[PDB]
C-alpha cells in the first residue's frame, strides 16, 4: 500500500517469508487523498515492512513479467 | 471511433495518442492492468 499526492495504490499477489521472486500486480487505486499517518488491522500472525525510495533494476522476462530484480 | 485495419500503414489514434504504422495481431501477454507496450526509446510498440 502507498499514498502519493493522495492517490492510494494497492498491489497484491497470491503466493502458494520464503525465497524467490513474485511481483505484485496492482488491483485497486483510490483517487481521493487521505492524509495518512496511521495503520491498523481488523479481524493469527502477519508481517510488516516499510518502503523507501530505492532505485531498482527490473528484469522483465520474455513473457513480460518481473522475474528478478536488483 | 472507426473500424480497425491491420497489415497496413495507417494513422491510428488510440485513446488520444496519435501515431502511424502497421497494426498486427500480437502474441504479447499484457496483464489486465497494462494498456501499452513500450520501446527502448519510449515508443509505443504495442497497444490495447
Amino acid at each position: 500500500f502507498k499514498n502519493i499526492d493522495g492517490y492510494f495504490k494497492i498491489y497484491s499477489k497470491h503466493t502458494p517469508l520464503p525465497q524467490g521472486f513474485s511481483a505484485l500486480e496492482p488491483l485497486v487505486d483510490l483517487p481521493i487523498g487521505i492524509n495518512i499517518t496511521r495503520f491498523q488491522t481488523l479481524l493469527a500472525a502477519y508481517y510488516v515492512g516499510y518502503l523507501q525510495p530505492r532505485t531498482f533494476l527490473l528484469k522483465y522476462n520474455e513473457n513480460g513479467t518481473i522475474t528478478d530484480a536488483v | 471511433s472507426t473500424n480497425l485495419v491491420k497489415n497496413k500503414c495507417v494513422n491510428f489514434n488510440f485513446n488520444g495518442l496519435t501515431g502511424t504504422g502497421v497494426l498486427t495481431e500480437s502474441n504479447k501477454k499484457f496483464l489486465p492492468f497494462q494498456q501499452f507496450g513500450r520501446d527502448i526509446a519510449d515508443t509505443t510498440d504495442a497497444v490495447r
Binding site: 498491489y11 517469508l17 520464503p18 525465497q19 524467490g20 521472486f21 513474485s22 511481483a23 505484485l24 500486480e25 496492482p26 508481517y47 515492512g49 518502503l51 531498482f56 533494476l57 527490473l58 528484469k59 522483465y60 522476462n61 520474455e62 513473457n63 513480460g64 518481473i66 530484480a69 | 504479447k28 499484457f30 496483464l31 492492468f33 497494462q34 494498456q35 501499452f36 507496450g37 513500450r38 527502448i40 504495442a46
Partner: peptide, 23 residues
C-alpha cells in the same frame, strides 16, 4: 519480533508492458 525480507516487495511500477528489457 523481527524477520528478514529476502526478495519481497517487488511490484510493477507502471501500467506499461515491457519485455526482455532490464528497466
Amino acid at each position: 519480533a523481527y524477520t528478514n525480507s529476502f526478495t519481497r516487495g517487488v511490484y510493477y511500477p507502471d501500467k506499461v508492458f515491457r519485455s526482455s528489457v532490464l528497466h
